[PDB]
Amino acid sequence: VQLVESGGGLVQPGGSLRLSCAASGFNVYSSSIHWVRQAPGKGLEWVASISSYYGYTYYADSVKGRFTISADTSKNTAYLQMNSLRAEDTAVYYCARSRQFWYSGLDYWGQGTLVTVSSASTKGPSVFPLAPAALGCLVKDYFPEPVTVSWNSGALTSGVHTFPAVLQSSGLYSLSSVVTVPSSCNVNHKPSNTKVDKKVEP
Amino acid sequence: SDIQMTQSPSSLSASVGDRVTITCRASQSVSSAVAWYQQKPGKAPKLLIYSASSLYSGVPSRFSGSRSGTDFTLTISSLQPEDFATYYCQQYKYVPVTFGQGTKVEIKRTVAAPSVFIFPPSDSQLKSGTASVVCLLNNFYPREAKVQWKVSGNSQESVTEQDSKDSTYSLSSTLTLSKADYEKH
Amino acid sequence: SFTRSTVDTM
Amino acid sequence: TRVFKKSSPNGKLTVYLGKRDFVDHLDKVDPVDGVVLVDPDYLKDRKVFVTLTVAFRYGREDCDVLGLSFRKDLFIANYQAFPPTPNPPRPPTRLQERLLRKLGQHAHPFFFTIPQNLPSSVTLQPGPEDTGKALGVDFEIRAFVAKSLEEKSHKRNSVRLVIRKVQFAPEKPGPQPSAETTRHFLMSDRSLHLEASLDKELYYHGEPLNVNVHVTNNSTKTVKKIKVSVRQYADIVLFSTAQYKVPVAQVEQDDQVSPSSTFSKVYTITPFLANNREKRGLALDGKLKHEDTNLASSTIVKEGANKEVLGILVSYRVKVKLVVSRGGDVSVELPFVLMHPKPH
């Protein structure tokens, strides 16, 4: 038994998207499909539910009419369509199954796909050295995630701490990594296809 | 209507094989339609107890729970070194379902003295027109701390995840201002 | 009205 | 540990039930045991009795303006709750003892035995053209206080509650179900061979039926279309023999079988209630008040053939129809069971 899904990406707010989640190893009829989203730093939030056997549809209060759900019995796949995207709808969405006879929780879960909504475009990283013991490299004004940053092409990972990237009010992302050198940086941005190497000395 | 969720406590820390109890509160009485879930950071959620009393297959017997009216409690016999994650309280007898606020679990250690480091903006950053001052706080305990800026708002704080190497934390806060503001002080 | 559960004690 | 209870509208008479559903193991049934709680000072001269009855009820109970059920009493039982009766049958039960501990002196236990020759709780689907609920056999517990058994019933005194009786699937699989049919022509020796088989004899609701059909059309006619369907049979017996059969699921394939050819295939058919929300006469599992359920579970008869014609009997069959050109259509049938598994 496995769960797979696809359809993630970045969409401009106010548009629409289609998500898919195929089911294998069980039956769509003898179960129900639930959709749940997980915002960064916030708990999982249920959005909608389908009951193929009973032919009933349910949605959350915040997505009444905006969000639609569908499923084809032949392919054992469920599809949900959402419209009029807003900035607060970005989260990581999951598709899960529940035993129809009877309800006993959500035993099986998919690996889950992230949903990002914003008007920001792709931006290359900007490496800013940080010198005075310790030394660090600062990457700011980049989009989108992720960025692979290594020190001296990953020569030594000892004393290296990389902090998670944050989203400031400008709409861009920024992270940093500091290496501890009491005595005495290569960053790659795969989505932007940018590699930057910098060296900082006191 | 909607049923309020009140988990307690929000998040505490303990040692290996300790007495840890997690309580769940609901604004309306629910008979037994209560489920317990645990989600490791960055992974998929997984239930532990369904119907508030049934232990799911492939789960250690150390987990158990009980009900007293609207009071729901989770009990763990001994804390495994891999059970440090978040837990959620769920009820499923009314439409719609309401989820818990999350109960992160972390390992406790001794107080660690931090390292104070101040880094001025670089020459390239100086020519960029934006001035940022970043203060580094590494190898400290506990997570909560108070550091003042005076040379103030418009500052971003970033703390990493619990480092298993020394059970300590690292903090990085940056104060971003303009060149005119930076040179004023 | 309707039905309801209750305490068992002991 | 939790325990259901129901109280009189006046709030003075209250009855406690530890279970809402009961099951039969083809040889014994779980006894109906409970305790009635009441202070004798309220009555001070009357007597308390609790009665078990099963009836063939039709329509609803919310004071509908229409002729109500043809109230046939299939079986009625009575027990003297107060004044207290002797110890049997045979001892007090464990849960009754615990409840007597919880309450004290004013706790009065009662015991009941369900005869093995009783039907299962089923309810026919009401029709949109009709009004209110529909016909169906139901169980009911009634407790009341009166000086005489034949005293007039009172709304404040009597209390009514509904219970259910259901069966569960045995763990022993049966013989493999299969069927065959060979039909020749009027004069020529050429024939038409068809065989149907199923994966198992017992399935679960929502699980597809993978019917295996093989056609050996070593004939001269051409089979136009093929139809596969499952039929639901509901035996209605009150004083006359009756049976109301309605199709539930139908699947058709536009497949042509050429003469002098062999064609075998496996097809999927799934019974579900979503597409038949309006079909009158459909049989459904017993509900509590009005809640929806799945299709009527196939009740299995006990080992003894006896009579057991005291209500509604249900069974399921599958039929495959071959549309043969210029007549000569041949269909085969196969019975099978479909009902819920045993929970834990």
- Domain locations along chain D: 4-166, 178-338
A105 touching B (Cβ < 8 Å) = yes
Chain B residue numbers with beta carbons less than 8 Å from the beta carbon of A132 are: 117, 119
**Residue B66: left if φ>0, alpha if ψ -120 to 50, beta else—which one?**
beta
What are phi and psi for residue A170, nearest 5 degrees?
A: -70, -10
Count Cα neighbours of D39 within 13 Å in the Cβ-side half-sphere.
4
| Stretch 29-68 of chain A: residues touching chain D, C-beta under 8 Å | 29-31, 52-55
Class of the CATH-defined domain A2-115: mainly beta
* Min distance C1 CA to chain D CA atoms (Å): 7
All structural domains of chain B, each given as residue ranges with its CATH number in brackets, are: 5-107 (2.60.40.10), 115-185 (2.60.40.10)
Tell me the C-alpha distance between D315 and D335, whole Å: 8
Query: Which class is A126-200 in CATH?
Result: mainly beta
Q: Where in chain A is the domain with CATH 2.60.40.10?
A: 2-115, 126-200
Residue D154 Cα to chain centre, angstroms: 32
Is residue D262 a contact partner of residue D215, using CB atoms and an 8 Å limit?
Answer: yes
d(C-alpha D261, C-alpha D244), whole Å:
38
Give the whole-angstrom CA distance, residue B176 versus residue B121. Answer: 10
3-state SS string for B104-120? CEEECCCCCCCEEEEEC
B and A make contact (3+ CB pairs below 8 Å): yes
Q: How far is CA B19 from the centre of its chain?
A: 19
Task: Please indicate whether, in this complex, the C-beta atoms of A54 and D273 are within 8 angstroms of each other.
Answer: yes
SS3 assignment, position A46 = strand
State how far residue A30 is from chain D, nearest Cα, in angstroms. 4
CB A126 within 8 A of CB A147: no
Per DSSP, chain D holds a count of helices (H) and strands (E) of 1, 21
Distance of alpha carbon A154 from alpha carbon A177, whole angstroms: 12
**Contact across the interface for D102 and C7, Cβ inside 8 Å:** yes
Check residue D311 and report its DSSP letter.
Answer: S
Substitution target from D166, D253, D272 for chain A, most A beta carbons within 10 A: D272
Contact call for residues B34 and B98 (beta carbons, < 8 A): no
Q: Chains C, A in contact: 3+ Cβ pairs under 8 A?
A: no
Contacts of A60 in chain B (CB under 8 A): 96
> Pairing state of beta strands D21-23 and A44-51?
unpaired
- Asked whether A118 and B105 are in contact (CB, 8 A), the reply is no
How many Cβ pairs within 8 Å bridge chains C and D?
A: 27
Whether D178-338 and D4-166 are alike in CATH topology: the answer is yes
CB contact (8 A) between residue B122 and residue A176? no
Distance in angstroms (rounded) separating the CA atoms of residues A201 and A130: 9
Nearest to B91 by CA among B145, B179, B29: B29
| CB-CB neighbors (< 8 A) of D98 in chain C | 8, 10
The owner of tokens 């529940």 is: A98
Work out the burial of residue B113: count CB atoms within 10 Å of its CB; fewer than 13 is exposed, 13-18 middle, 19 or more buried: exposed
Other beta carbons within 10 angstroms of residue D158's beta carbon come to: 16
Q: ∠ at Cα B25 (B23, B31), nearest 5°?
A: 105
Q: Mention every residue, 6+ apart, whose C-beta is less than 8 A from residue A39.
A: A45, A90, A91, A92
Q: How many Cβ atoms are within 10 Å of D233's Cβ, its own excluded?
A: 16
Per DSSP, A200 falls in state -
Dist. CA A91–CA A67, nearest whole Å: 15
Q: C3: which chain D residues are within 8 Å (Cβ-Cβ)?
A: 4-6, 161
Method: cryo-EM
Q: What are phi and psi of D274, to 5 degrees?
A: -65, -40
Alpha helices in chain D (DSSP H): 94-103
**What's the burial of B95, exposed, middle or buried (CB within 10 Å: 0-12/13-18/19+)?**
exposed
Architecture of domain D4-166: Sandwich (2.60)
Please name every residue paired with A99 in a beta bridge, in sequence order, or none if there are none. A31
Taking CA atoms, what residue in B is nearest to A167? B156
Contacts A110 to B, Cβ<8 Å: 44
| Token pair in block for residue D298 | 């196939």
> Given D5, D7, D102, which is nearest C9 (Cβ)?
D102
H/E/C letters for each residue in B1-27?
CCCCEEEECCCEEECCCCCEEEEEEEC
Q: Which residues pair with B136 in a beta bridge?
A: B117, B172
The fold for domain D178-338 equals Immunoglobulin-like (2.60.40)
Strand pairing of D330-338 and D202-203? parallel
Identity of residue D205: H
Give the C-alpha separation, D334 to D233, whole Å. 13
Rounded Cα gap, residues B24 and D307, in angstroms: 54
CB contact under 8 A, A180 and B138: yes
Task: Please identify which residue in the block is written with the tokens 């024939």.
Answer: D191
The minimum CA-CA distance between D3 and chain C, rounded to whole Å, is 5
Asked if residue D125 lies in contact with residue D287, where contact means CB atoms within 8 angstroms, the answer is: no
Query: How many Å lie between the alpha carbon of C9 and the closest alpha carbon of chain D?
Result: 6
Q: State how far the Cα of A159 lies from the Cα of B144, in Å rounded to an integer.
A: 22
SS3 assignment for chain B: CCCCEEEECCCEEECCCCCEEEEEEECCCCCCCEEEEEECCCCCEEEEEECCCEECCCCCCCEEEEEECCEEEEEECCCCCCCCCEEEEEECCCCCCEECCCCCEEECCCCCCCEEEEECCCHHHHHHCEEEEEEEEEEECCCCCCCCCCCCCCEEEEECCCECCCCEEEEEEEEEEEHHHHHHC
- Rounded to whole angstroms, the Cα distance separating B140 from B172 reads 12
